[PDB]
Each structure stands twice: as C-alpha cells, then as structure tokens.
Amino acid sequence: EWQENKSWNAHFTEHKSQGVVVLWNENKQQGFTNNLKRANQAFLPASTFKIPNSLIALDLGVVKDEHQVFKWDGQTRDIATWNRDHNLITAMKYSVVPVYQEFARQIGEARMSKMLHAFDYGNEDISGNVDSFWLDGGIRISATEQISFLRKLYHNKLHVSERSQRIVKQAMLTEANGDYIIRAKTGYSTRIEPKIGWWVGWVELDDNVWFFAMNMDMPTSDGLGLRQAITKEVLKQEKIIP
Amino acid sequence: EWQENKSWNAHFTEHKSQGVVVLWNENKQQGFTNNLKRANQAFLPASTFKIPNSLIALDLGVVKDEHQVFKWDGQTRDIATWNRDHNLITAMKYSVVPVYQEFARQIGEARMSKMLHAFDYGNEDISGNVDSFWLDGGIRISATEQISFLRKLYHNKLHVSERSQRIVKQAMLTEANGDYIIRAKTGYSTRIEPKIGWWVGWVELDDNVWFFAMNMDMPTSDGLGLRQAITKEVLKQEKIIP
Numbered sequence: 001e002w003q004e005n006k007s008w009n010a011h012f013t014e015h016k017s018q019g020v021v022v023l024w025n026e027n028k029q030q031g032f033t034n035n036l037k038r039a040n041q042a043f044l045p046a047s048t049f050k051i052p053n054s055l056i057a058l059d060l061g062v063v064k065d066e067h068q069v070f071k072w073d074g075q076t077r078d079i080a081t082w083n084r085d086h087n088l089i090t091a092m093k094y095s096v097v098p099v100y101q102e103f104a105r106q107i108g109e110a111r112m113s114k115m116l117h118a119f120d121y122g123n124e125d126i127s128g129n130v131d132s133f134w135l136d137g138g139i140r141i142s143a144t145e146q147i148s149f150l151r152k153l154y155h156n157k158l159h160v161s162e163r164s165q166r167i168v169k170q171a172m173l174t175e176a177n178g179d180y181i182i183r184a185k186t187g188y189s190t191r192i193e194p195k196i197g198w199w200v201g202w203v204e205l206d207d208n209v210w211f212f213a214m215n216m217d218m219p220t221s222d223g224l225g226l227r228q229a230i231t232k233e234v235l236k237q238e239k240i241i242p
Numbered sequence: 243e244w245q246e247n248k249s250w251n252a253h254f255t256e257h258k259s260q261g262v263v264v265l266w267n268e269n270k271q272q273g274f275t276n277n278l279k280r281a282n283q284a285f286l287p288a289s290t291f292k293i294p295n296s297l298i299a300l301d302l303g304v305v306k307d308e309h310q311v312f313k314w315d316g317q318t319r320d321i322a323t324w325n326r327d328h329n330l331i332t333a334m335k336y337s338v339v340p341v342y343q344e345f346a347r348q349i350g351e352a353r354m355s356k357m358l359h360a361f362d363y364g365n366e367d368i369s370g371n372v373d374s375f376w377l378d379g380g381i382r383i384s385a386t387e388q389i390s391f392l393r394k395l396y397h398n399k400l401h402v403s404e405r406s407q408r409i410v411k412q413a414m415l416t417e418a419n420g421d422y423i424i425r426a427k428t429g430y431s432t433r434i435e436p437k438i439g440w441w442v443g444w445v446e447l448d449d450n451v452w453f454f455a456m457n458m459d460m461p462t463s464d465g466l467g468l469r470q471a472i473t474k475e476v477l478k479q480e481k482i483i484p
C-alpha cells in the first residue's frame with residue numbers, strides 16, 4: 001500500500017532542490033512518494049502546527065470562533081502582514097506566529113501535551129517553550145504522520161468537537177476552482193537545522209480525496225514558493241489536477 | 243443606505259442583455275445596484291433554492307452530513323453529471339435537481355412551508371408541487387431578498403443549527419485564492435417567463451465581506467457563463483477583487 005515513484009525526483013532536481021512529496025489516495029487506501037525514507041523522517045512541524053494548535057485553542061475556548069479579533073500587540077515585526085489585527089482565518093493565512101504563541105500560552109503546558117497525545121501527533125513531545133516548541137523544541141513529525149493526522153481531521157475523527165474541526169478545515173482553505181479544492185497549511189522551519197519548508201493538506205475532487213505532505217530543504221526563503229509549485233507539478237503528473 | 247449607479251447597465255447591455263446586480267458592503271452597511279426596481283422584483287429562485295433546501299434537509303436529518311451518498315436512481319437524464327452518485331457538495335456544484343427533489347418530498351409540505359417562513363425567504367409560498375415548486379410553483383424572491391437571506395446565513399442567524407449553516411456554507415464554496423473566497427449558488431429559471439439566470443452569494447476578503455445577488459435575462463442556455471462573468475467584472479470595476 002506504498003509505492004516509490006522516483007520519477008518525481010526530477011521535479012525536485014529541476015529546481016536544484018531536495019525533498020519528498022507523499023500522496024495518499026483515500027479511495028484506494030494507497031500511498032505514493034518519491035522517497036519512502038524521507039517520507040518517514042520526522043521534522044519540526046513549524047507553522048504546520050497551526051492546524052493542531054487551532055483545533056486545541058477552539059475546543060478549549062481560547063478562540064471563541066473564526067471572527068474573534070486578536071489585536072496586534074504593537075510590536076513591529078519584519079513580516080508586515082503580522083503587524084495588524086487578525087482572526088483565525090487571516091492568522092492561518094499569513095502564518096501569524098505571535099497570535100498562535102498567545103494561543104499556546106493560554107492553552108498551557110499540560111493541556112497542550114495531553115491534546116497532542118490524544119491526536120497521536122508525531123512524537124507527542126512538546127519539550128521546550130510552550131510558545132515555541134514547534135519552531136525550536138523537541139516535537140517531531142514525519143510526512144506520513146502528517147497525513148495520518150490530516151485523515152482524522154478530514155473525517156472529524158480527532159478527539160475534539162466536530163465544530164472545532166469544521167472551523168479549522170475552513171481556516172485551512174487555500175484554493176478552490178471548478179476542478180478541485182485544496183485545504184492545506186505551509187510551514188517553514190528555520191531555528192534548528194535542517195532548514196526545511198512544509199506543505200501539508202489534501203486535494204478534494206468530486207469522487208476522491210488526495211492527502212499530501214511534502215517537505216524540502218530550504219536553505220533560504222528564496223525558494224519558499226517551490227513548496228506549492230513542486231507539489232502541483234507532481235499532482236499534475238499523476239493527473240490529479242489539470 | 244442604497245445607491246443606484248445606472249452606468250452599470252452597460253455590463254448587461256454590452257452583451258445584448260438586461261439584468262440587475264446588487265452589492266452589499268457588510269462593514270459600511272451600504273448597498274449598490276444598477277436598477278432599484280428590478281433589484282426588488284421577485285423571480286422564481288430555481289437552483290438558488292438549493293441553499294435553503296440544503297439547510298432544511300440537514301437540520302431535519304433528511305441529510306446526515308456532506309459525505310452521505312445520494313445514489314443515482316438509474317434514470318438517464320440529459321445532464322451527464324446528474325447520472326452519477328452525489329453528496330451535498332457535488333449536488334450543489336452541479337445543481338443536481340433530482341437529488342433536491344427527493345430532499346423536498348422527504349422534507350414535506352408542512353415542514354418546508356414552515357421553515358421558509360422561519361427563514362423569511364421570499365414570498366414564502368410553496369404553492370405547487372412539493373418536489374418542484376421552486377421551478378414552476380408560486381415561490382418568488384428578489385435580489386435584495388436573496389441578500390437579506392444570505393446575510394443571516396453568513397452570521398449563523400437563521401433558525402437552524404450552526405452546524406447546518408456551516409455545512410451549507412461549505413457546500414457553497416465556489417472559488418478561493420490568495421485574494422478572495424466566493425461562496426455562491428447559480429440559478430437558471432426556464433419554466434415561467436421571463437427566463438433568467440441567477441448568481442447569489444458573497445465574496446470574503448481579509449477585512450470585509452461583500453454580498454452579491456444578480457439575475458439577468460437568459461433566453462437560451464448559451465449565455466449562462468455571463469452570470470458569473472458579468473458579476474466578477476462589476477466586482478473588479480468596484481475594486482472589490484483585483
């Protein structure tokens with residue numbers, strides 16, 4: 001139920017890159033990747049952790065709903081879109097770390113740990129700062145593990161309210177047209193080597209769902225756009241999107 | 243509160259057509275239209291009725307959720323996409339009338355009439371056949387009334403569970419990208435004169451929401467693409483979308 005398609009490596013080599021794309025066909029219950037080993041290598045989730053962090057904040061009432069405004073703390077930061085008020089949707093859209101670091105502080109060490117165990121999330125280890133462990137702490141998760149987690153989310157099978165899971169899946173909305181819907185989240189781990197970029201989510205089709213999880217060596221922010229572009233090239237090759 | 247910009251009539255007359263666009267700025271509580279009379283003229287809702295119909299079906303348990311499969315009855319119809327199994331998402335996307343006719347029959351006359359009054363939906367008159375009144379029956383709704391209904395749906399203020407409204411708003415998803423999300427529903431009314439096409443919904447921005455409701459003369463199916471094409475050009479012109 002796992003095949004290695006090394007031809008996808010071209011899509012990484014065309015861009016002088018290195019990484020893995022993992023695809024999962026829900027209907028066929030069958031997985032596909034260019035590199036099974038990197039597919040099972042666990043990394044810092046970085047801002048892909050904003051998915052579980054959102055679920056937990058919502059289910060605990062830290063976030064009332066997707067319209068609640070989280071006021072800028074007035075601290076100017078070097079990402080302009082962070083220096084403004086946000087709600088859950090825009091916070092996820094722009095990967096606003098400081099808003100989610102506030103979520104985590106209010107969640108707390110004990111509840112965060114208990115919830116990630118309930119989620120069976122990666123290595124379930126939050127060692128480090130309660131408000132940065134997913135950027136430079138001990139938590140690790142692989143691409144195949146990201147998919148497993150996402151499959152539960154898609155099916156409302158995580159041990160949080162159906163409402164919390166619906167709200168996050170709405171916040172995850174990235175792209176939709178007449179051919180498909182993508183709900184996903186980007187990630188960018190920089191504080192601890194190796195620097196990598198993430199893209200995890202799923203593609204909704206009329207008759208199937210293709211879960212995906214990719215990470216790639218990201219020495220500089222210059223190549224961040226390759227997270228989505230390389231994934232789409234593979235999706236296009238496998239005839240999943242036009 | 244309202245403003246009429248007759249100039250916008252060019253959007254319709256340049257395609258040898260006539261119609262109305264109605265825009266509502268949620269933040270400013272302001273409305274805009276090319277034609278005040280036609281914005282308050284009531285037409286058959288046709289497939290835009292699948293919004294309230296889905297809400298009622300879900301809230302009464304006629305539809306369990308957006309994953310439940312409604313099996314094709316094996317009767318070949320002239321729309322290829324209708325000759326398939328469907329769920330709430332795809333039945334909305336393809337305006338699968340026979341799936342929603344079965345919804346109505348199970349909903350029943352009494353509960354249907356009573357929910358439409360609860361919704362304050364159009365003239366609230368289901369006279370005709372319970373499985374087709376929104377096609378050739380007595381119910382009517384205007385573009386402004388469509389907006390009054392959608393705004394309640396957005397704010398989860400309709401008299402159904404939040405879950406029912408979230409699910410229906412998920413099923414309304416039409417387009418999403420880095421700039422805006424459109425949730426909407428198309429309509430096409432041919433059984434009573436005048437033949438018209440609908441497009442109703444809203445566009446979600448980072449800092450605002452714009453509700454829209456449009457209908458336009460549709461003497462043949464050739465011009466159905468204009469329902470969304472014209473609307474988006476008004477949105478671009480008003481700089482609501484790039």
Ligand SMILES: O=C(O)c1cccc(-c2nccs2)c1
Pocket residue numbers: 047048095186187188221224
């Ligand atoms: O992709 C992401 O999740 C992400 C998260 C936070 C910051 C960034 C940055 N983008 C440019 C320079 S730092 C990206």
Ligand SMILES: [Cl-]
Pocket residue numbers: 169170173411412415
């Ligand atoms: Cl959605």
